[PDB]
Design a binder for this molecule. Structure first.
Ligand SMILES: Nc1nc2c(ncn2[C@@H]2O[C@H](COP(=O)(O)OP(=O)(O)CP(=O)(O)O)[C@@H](O)[C@H]2O)c(=O)[nH]1
Ligand SMILES: [Mg+2]
Lengths: 48, 48
């Protein structure tokens, strides 16, 4: 999962630290979780 | 929707397609969808 998430992360923007405002949906199904939505966001940047 | 390739259209018995849907398939790096009322929002999962 960890490898694939960053593979999808750079499959759209490249390796040159560009970003895309298109989210990445992911669903973890487990008996140990609620029906929760955790929105991880990219770090805020001031200079390109 | 089968010509598009991805299931994102209302399909059921009776009257379902009750409003003219002007789809525009366009080309970009990765897939999402945007309406003209949820401006800014980027729908990504086709159930939604
Ligand atoms: N067995 C079977 N069912 C089909 C086939 N094609 C469509 N159906 C069924 O027709 C019903 C409605 O499908 P749909 O394409 O949404 O019709 P529609 O054109 O949107 C109805 P309207 O245009 O009036 O709003 C569905 O239940 C679908 O399963 C088919 O080839 N075989
Ligand atoms: Mg219809």
């Amino acid at each position: 999962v960890r490898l694939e998430i960053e593979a999808e992360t750079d499959r759209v923007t490249g390796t040159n630290k560009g970003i895309s405002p298109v989210p990445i949906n992911l669903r973890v199904y487990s008996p140990h979780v609620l029906n929760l939505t955790l929105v991880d966001l990219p770090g805020m940047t001031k200079v390109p | 929707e089968n010509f598009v390739g991805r299931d994102f259209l209302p399909r059921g018995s009776g009257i379902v397609t009750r409003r003219p849907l002007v789809l525009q398939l366009v080309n970009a790096t990765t897939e999402y969808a945007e309406f003209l009322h949820c401006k800014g929002k980027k729908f990504t999962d086709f159930e939604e």
